Amino acid sequence: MEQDKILAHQASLNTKPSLLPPPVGNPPPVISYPFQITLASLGTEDAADSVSIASNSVLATYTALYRHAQLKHLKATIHPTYMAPKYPTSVALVWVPANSTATSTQVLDTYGGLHFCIGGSVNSVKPIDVEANLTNLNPIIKASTTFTDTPKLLYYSKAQATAPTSPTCYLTIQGQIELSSPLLQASS
Amino acid sequence: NTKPSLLPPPVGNPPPVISYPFQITLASLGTEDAADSVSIASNSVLATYTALYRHAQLKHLKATIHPTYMAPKYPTSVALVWVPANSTATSTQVLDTYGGLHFCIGGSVNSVKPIDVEANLTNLNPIIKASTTFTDTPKLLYYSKAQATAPTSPTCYLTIQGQIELSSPLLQASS
Amino acid sequence: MEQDKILAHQASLNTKPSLLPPPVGNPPPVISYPFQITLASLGTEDAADSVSIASNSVLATYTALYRHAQLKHLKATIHPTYMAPKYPTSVALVWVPANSTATSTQVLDTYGGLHFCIGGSVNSVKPIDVEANLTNLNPIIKASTTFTDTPKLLYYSKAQATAPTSPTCYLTIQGQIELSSPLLQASS
Amino acid sequence: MEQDKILAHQASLNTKPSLLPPPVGNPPPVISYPFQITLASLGTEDAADSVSIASNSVLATYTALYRHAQLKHLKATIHPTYMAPKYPTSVALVWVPANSTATSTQVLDTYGGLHFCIGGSVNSVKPIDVEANLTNLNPIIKASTTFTDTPKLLYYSKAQATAPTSPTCYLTIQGQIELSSPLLQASS
Amino acid sequence: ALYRHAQLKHLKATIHPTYMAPKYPTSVALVWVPANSTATSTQVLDTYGGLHFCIGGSVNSVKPIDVEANLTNLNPIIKASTTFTDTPKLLYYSKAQATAPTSPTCYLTIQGQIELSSPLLQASS
RNA sequence: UUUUUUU
RNA sequence: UUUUUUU
RNA sequence: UUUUUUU
RNA sequence: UUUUUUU
C-alpha cells in the first residue's frame, strides 16, 4: 500500500522572529495629558472628512516630544449652538480602525454607524457623546513600531439648503493621552 | 527613557478564529526557462480572504510539484527554497542557499511522482496580517530549466497549499 | 438632578489588535561584533548631513546575515589630522531618534548636541568621542518589523574660507552590535 | 444620563421552525448495495466533466426504488490500460460538495486537487484510488429533503497530441449505498 | 507652560567654541546665583563658584566647557502654586578682541532636565 | 535534502 | 460633558 | 407596541 | 483494488 507522493525536506536551523525585549531596566515614567480639540464647525455647508487620530496636527503638538503615546480615554462630542433650533442639521459619524477602507459617505453602511438630527424646535439641543472603544481600536497612536489599526473617525454632515452664517454645532474630540519616553527635538 | 512598544493586556475573551483553506497554481513549467520569487504575504489571492480581517496567520503551508503527461519524455529541472521575505537571495541561487533543493522531473524511473516541500513555519514568520507589518514572512524562490527542444504543453505544475487562520473582523462598508 | 448630555453607543464587537504569537522553543545564541566605520572627511568645504544608522550601507554588510541586530555601545569620534592646526574647523554633532524633526543647523538647540573647534592650535589630543545614549535611542536596528526611533546622527561643519586640499579631520562611528537568528542568504 | 434611542417591541408568539419528527414507529430496514460504475474512457482526446453523484443516471437506477439513499463508502479509481505505457496521459481530479462553484478546469486551484501522470515506460501503471471523504461531503444523495452539499467529482484529462485509438485508462467510481423506504414506482 | 509644577533635576551652562576662536581669543566669565542675589556680571570672580575663561587663542577647543549649577544653593523649583525668590540666575560677562570677527567665537547654552507634573489647562489651538 | 527546527 | 478628580 | 416569545 | 467479507 504505497503512497503517491514524495516528501522532500528543507533543512532547518534555529532562527526566530523578534520584536522588543522586556523593560527590566526601570519601566519609564508615564504622564497623562488631557485635551479637547475642535475638529469642525458644522451647519453652514455640507461637510465630510476622515480624521486619523494618529495623524492629527493638533494632537501631534503634544506627542511630538515623546516616543510613546497611548490614549487612555477618547470620545467625540457634538455641541449644538444657538443656531441649531432654527436650522436642523444632520451629523453622522462612526469610529473605525485606520486601516478600514470605509469612507465618510458610508457611515450608515458600516456596523455601528450613527446618524443624528441636531436642532429643530421640537428637538433637543442637548450635546451628544460618542465614545471610541479603545479595546477594539488600538490606543497606541505613537510608538517605536508603526501600527495600522489606530482610531479613525469618519463624519458626514448635511446642512439646510438655505443655511445660516454661523455654525449650528461643533464637533470636538476629547480625552487623555499617556505620554512617555522623551524624544529629542530642538527648542528653536 | 527606553519605552519602544508592546500591547495593552487582552481585556476579555480572545476573538474567535476560523481556518480557510487554499491551493494556488503559481506556475506551469517545462516549456521554457522560468524563475521567480513569490512573497506570500503580498499574494493577490490570499489578500481577498484576509481583506475582511485584522489578523491572518498561516497554519500549514507547502509547495507541491505535479509532473504531467509530458514529463516522461521531457525531463525538466525545478529548484526551489523557502526564505524569509527580507532575504536578498535570488531565484538563480537556490543551490547556494542553505536548504535549497534541485529536482529532476521526468525521464528516469520513479521520477513522475509528485513532490511536497513544506515551509517551516517555526523558521519563517507565519503572521501575514496584524497590527503592524512584518518583514520576515514566507517567500518562495523557484527556478526551472527546460529542454532546448521543449514541448508545447507543461511538464509540471507548481502549486502551494495551506490554511490561514483569520480573526478580528475589520470594519468595512457594505456598499 | 438631570444631566445635560446624551450618550450614544456605537455597537461593538470582539475584534482586538495583535502582534507576534508567544515565543516557542529555545532562543537562538547571540554574538557581539565590534566595528568602526568612517562616515566623512571634513575640513575642505562646509558640510552638513544626517546619517540614519539603521540604513547605513557599510554596517548593513554585518547585519545582512542576521534577522536581529541590536547595538550594545555606539559612539561618534572626530579624529584630527596634520592639517587641522593651520585650518581650524568647526564641527557640531548630536544623536537623535530617527523620527526627530531636528536638523543639522539645530545641534545646539538639541539636548546633548556639542559644537567643537577642531585644530587651530589645539584639539589634537586623544580624538573626541560623543557617545550615543541608548536609553534615548532605540538600539534595535533590525528585527521582524521596522522601528521609527533608531539612532540618527546629525552633523554640521564649517570650513575656513580659504580651505585646504586635504581633510582636517575624519568623522567615524564605532560600536558593538549584537547579532542573532541567521537570515538565509546566498553564499555566491 | 439619557440614551439616544427608542426601542420598539414587535409582539411575539410561540411559533418555531420544524423538520421531520422522530422514527419511534419501527426504524425502517436498511439494505446495503454495492456498485462500480465506469465514468469515462480517457486518453484518446482531452476531456473534462463534472459528475454530481446524486444526479448520475446509472447510480439513479438503484436509488429510483427508494426514498432514502446514503453512501457508506465512495472512491474514484484510475485504471491504466495496455496503451498507457506508450501514451502518457494526464488526469486531474478533486471531490467537492455539489454546491461548490469550482469547475473541471480549476482542479489544481482547489484545496486538495490532485494531478497525476498515468503511463510512461519509466512510470508505473499501478491503478490509483482517491477516496471521497464522506464526513466533509454529505453522503445522503436521496431523501425527503433535498441537500445541496452531496459529492461532486471534477476531473480533467489531457491526451497526447498524436493520440491512440484505444483509451489509456478508465476512470470509475465504486462504493456501497444504503437504501431504505421503498418508493412506489411502476413495473411496466 | 503645560504644567503647574516644574522642578530642575540637573542644570548646567556650556561654552562651545567655534572655528573663529583661535584667531580671536575671547574672555568669558560666568557664575550661577539665586535670583535674589545682588551680584552683577562684573563681579563674577568675587562670587563663590564664578569662573573666568579664555576661549580659543590657540587652545580651549577641547570638549566644551561645562559649569554646573549647584541645586542646593539655588532653588530648583521654577514653577509652583507661588512664585519663589531664589531660583537660578546666570550671570555672564564677555570681552571681545578690539578688532572683532563677524562670526561668533563661541556659543553659550544651558542644558538640563526638568521634572514636570500636574497638567495646567491650556487651549490646544 | 544538500536531513540538526519543533526545548 | 466633550463624563476618569475626590486614594 | 398594537407588550404574553426566550420552559 | 476501484480496499468495508471473515461477528
Q: Which fold has domain B1-175?
A: Jelly Rolls (2.60.120)
- From the CB of residue D57, how many other CB atoms can be counted at a distance below 10 Å? 7
Helix, strand, coil percentages, rounded to 5, for chain C: 10, 45, 50
DSSP E strand boundaries for B1-126: 17-29, 34-39, 53-67, 76-84, 101-105, 115-118
Task: Determine whether the distance from the CB of D18 to the nearest atom of strand H is below 7 Å.
Answer: no
Give partners of D (≥3 CB pairs < 8 A): A, B, C
Q: Is D156 helix (H, G, I), strand (E, B) or coil?
A: strand
Cβ atoms of residues B141 and B28 within 8 Å: no
Q: Which residue of C has its CA nearest to E18?
A: C117
Distance from CA of C145 to the nearest CA of B (A): 5
- Cβ of B69 within 8 Å of Cβ of D160? The answer is yes
Helix or strand (DSSP H, E) at A61: helix A57-63
Residue position matching grid coordinates 451647519: A43
Distance in angstroms, CA of D75 to C1' of I2?
A: 7
Query: Is the CB of residue C114 less than 8 Å from the CB of residue C95?
Result: no
- Residue labelled with grid coordinates 534615548: C136
Rounded distance between C-alpha atoms, residue B79 and residue C141, angstroms: 33
- Containing H/E element for A59? helix A57-63
- Which nucleotide comes closest to B98 if you measure CA to C1'? F2
- Alpha-carbon distance C52 to nearest alpha carbon in chain E (angstroms): 24
The CA distance from A4 to B107, in Å, is 18
CATH of C1-188, one of 2.60.120.20, 2.30.40.10, 3.90.420.10, 3.40.50.720: 2.60.120.20
Chain B residue with minimum CA distance to A11: B99
Beta pairing class for A6-8 and B115-118: parallel
Residue appearing with cell numbers 528653536 = A188
Question: E86 Cβ partners below 8 Å, 6+ apart?
Answer: E34, E35, E36, E74, E75
Q: How far apart are the first and last CA of chain C?
A: 80
Query: How far are the Cα atoms of A70, A92, B127, B133, B170 from residue A99, in angstroms, in the given order?
Result: 18, 20, 17, 12, 8
Beta bridge partners of C49: C155
CA separation for the pair E45, E91 (Å, rounded): 11
Distance (Å, whole) CA B56 – CA B175? 24
CA triple B169-B118-D123, angle to 5 deg: 130
> Could you tell me which CATH number the domain at E1-125 has?
2.60.120.20
Is A129's Cβ below 8 Å from some Cβ in D?
no
SS3 of B74, please?
coil
User: What CA–CA distance (Å, rounded) separates E38 from E84?
Assistant: 16
Residue corresponding to grid cell 507541491 = B64
Interchain contact E53–C (C-beta under 8 A): no
Cell of B156: 509540471
Q: Which of D141, D175, D119 is nearest to D67 (CA)?
A: D141
CA–CA distance from B166 to each of B47, B59, C177, D102 (Å)? 12, 10, 37, 22
Residues 84..123 of E with a Cβ closer than 8 Å to A: which? 116-117, 119, 121
Nearest to B22 by CA among B160, B139, B130, B116: B160
Name the grid cell of E103. 562670526
Resolution (Å) of this entry: 2.7
> What nine digits make up the cell of E85?
525668590
User: If DSSP codes are grouped into helix, strand and coil, which group holds residue A100?
Assistant: coil
Distance (Å) from the alpha carbon of E58 to chain A's nearest alpha carbon: 31
CA A60 to each of CA A171, B131, C149, D135: distance values in angstroms, whole numbers, following the listed order: 19, 21, 16, 57
CA dihedral (D118, D123, D125, D127) positive or negative: negative
Select the residue of C24, C144, C149 nearest B136 (Cβ to Cβ): C144
Radius of gyration of chain A (CA): 23
Reading the block at residue C18, the C-alpha cell is 495583535
What chain D residue is nearest to B151 in terms of C-alpha separation?
A: D161
Listed in sequence order, the residues at least 6 apart from E4 whose beta carbon sits closer than 8 Å to its beta carbon are: E79, E80, E81, E117, E118, E119, E120
Query: Distance between CA C130 and CA C74 in Å, rounded?
Result: 9
Q: Is the CB of D10 under 7 A from strand H?
A: yes
Short-list A129, A66, A61, A70, CA closest to A95: A129
Residue C27 DSSP SS3: coil
D79 CA to I6 C1' distance (Å): 28
**Grid coordinates belonging to C6:** 446624551
- Amino acid sitting at position B98: Y
Residue E25 CA to residue C117 CA, distance in Å, equals 13
The owner of cell 543647523 is: C105
Residue D70 is placed in which grid cell?
446514503
**Residue keyed to cell 577642531:** C118
Tell me the backbone φ, ψ of residue B91, rounded to 5 degrees: -55, -25
For residues C145 and C64, give the distance between their C-alpha atoms in angstroms, rounded to a whole number: 15
**Rounded distance, CA D108 to CA D155, Å?**
10
Residue C2, SS3 per DSSP: coil
- What is the number of other CB atoms lying within 10 angstroms of the CB of residue C23? 11
Closest residue, by C-alpha, to the C1' of F1: A9
The set of residues, in sequence order, having a beta carbon less than 8 Å from that of B106 and lying 6+ positions away, is B67, B70, B71, B72, B73, B74, B75, B76, B112, B155, B156, D122
Chain D contacts of B111, Cβ < 8 Å?
122
Q: What are the residue ranges spanned by the domains of chain B?
A: 1-175
Indicate the residue type of C58: V
Dmax (CA) of chain C: 84
- One-letter identity of residue D144: S
Give the other-Cβ count within 10 Å of A158's Cβ. 17
Nine cell digits for residue C150: 533608531
Distance from chain centroid for Cα E78: 15
- How many H helices and E strands in chain D? 1, 10
Q: Which of B131, B134, B130 is nearest to C68 (CA)?
A: B134
